[PDB]
Specification:
1 chains, alpha+beta, 4-stranded antiparallel sheet, 10 strands, elongated, binds adenosine-5'-triphosphate, Ryanodine receptor 2
Length: 337
């Protein structure tokens, strides 16, 4: 609402609204509709088949403010629009239509053909977002009206399964809205108002919005199973690929502290190909879903090794040792984060 509307859109919005409404009245007459004073559906009767001045002007103003909000959301979403040239709006070629596809009156509704206009992929994403906004507005209207979501459509209880996010909406209706809005956008583009979408900016959630402030959970064996001598082996299978650390930890490891950030833990972060002990150093490669990590510790000569599906991981140097020398201390236990 706070957006201010440029004068050229201001004196072109009426013609845009009438032309797009005429596109829908051409769509319904192609789908097989017939004009009727009463707003029937089974008998194919509705006043919204005739041109913009011959149907109820209250519906005309409804669709006019619909066009206004469409273009005004186009501006609100940062899609600045200019004109290619004023003569491209002065002269518009008209398609040829059969009479049955034509309306009742002689005001030829159909604009220059859809084939002439090309839609940039950025513009396609722009129409995708604009239809998202339109569906959100429509749903919010019925939310104020009292409608709520239901698994099955109900009229007396005011329950509609369509009151769902657009990403979960039904494909047929969402694509119908998509194509209608795409026809409208193609019309504005053909009018010489070549709209360029704002530069596509990438946003990363980075696993920040985890449920509850807990960012990780550490799983370890019991302290009594700590090994102080000998060489041992255990496996870690990664169902998913992401922020995972596996290795060996001392019985003093703190659950709230990340593995390898301090001395108690020796871990291998394969998300970043990153080894962790009192800091992070580059070691090995990254895994994928289903990869199995084999962890080796030899408490006699104080070395640790890792494998990824069998092949031994190597650091920046050709050394096979993830960690070269560490005190035995109180022992080590298997651990994962
Ligand atoms: N000016 C118009 N011209 C043509 N069709 C219109 C117009 N205004 C509304 N409609 C139709 O009426 C619908 C309005 O939805 P409404 O809230 O009345 O029904 P609903 O019970 O929520 O529908 P659904 O089961 O599709 O969710 C629009 O989706 C569209 O199909």
């Amino acid at each position: 609402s706070q957006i201010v509307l440029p004068p050229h859109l201001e004196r072109i919005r009426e013609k845009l609204a009438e032309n797009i409404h005429e596109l829908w009245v051409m769509n319904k007459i192609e789908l097989g509709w017939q004009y009727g004073p009463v707003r029937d559906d089974n008998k194919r009767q509705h006043p919204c088949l005739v041109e913009f001045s011959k149907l109820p002007e209250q519906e005309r103003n409804y669709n006019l403010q619909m066009s206004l909000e469409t273009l005004k959301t186009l501006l609100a979403l940062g899609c600045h629009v200019g004109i290619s040239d004023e003569h491209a709006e002065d002269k518009v070629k008209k398609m040829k239509l059969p009479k049955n596809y034509q309306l009742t009156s002689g005001y030829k509704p159909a604009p220059m053909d859809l084939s002439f206009i090309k839609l940039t992929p950025s513009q396609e994403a722009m129409v995708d977002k604009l239809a998202e906004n339109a569906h959100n507005v429509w749903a919010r209207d019925r939310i104020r009206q009292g409608w709520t979501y239901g698994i099955q459509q109900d009229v007396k209880n005011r329950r509609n399964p369509r009151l769902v996010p657009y990403t979960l909406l039904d494909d047929r209706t969402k694509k119908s809205n998509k194509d209608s809005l795409r026809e409208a956008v193609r019309t504005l583009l053909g009018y010489g108002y070549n709209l360029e979408a704002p530069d596509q900016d990438h946003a990363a959630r980075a696993e920040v919005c985890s449920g509850t402030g807990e960012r990780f959970r550490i799983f370890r064996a019991e302290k009594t199973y700590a090994v102080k001598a000998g060489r041992w082996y255990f496996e870690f299978e990664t169902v998913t690929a992401g922020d995972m650390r596996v290795g060996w930890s001392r019985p003093g490891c703190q659950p709230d502290q990340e593995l390898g950030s301090d001395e108690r833990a020796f871990a291998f972060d394969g998300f970043k190909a990153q080894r962790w002990h009192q800091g992070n150093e580059h070691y090995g490669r990254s895994w994928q879903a289903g990869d199995v990590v084999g962890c080796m510790v030899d408490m006699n000569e104080h070395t640790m090794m890792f494998t990824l599906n069998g092949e031994i991981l190597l650091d920046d140097s050709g050394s096979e040792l993830a960690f070269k020398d560490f005190d035995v201390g109180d022992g080590f236990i298997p651990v994962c984060s």
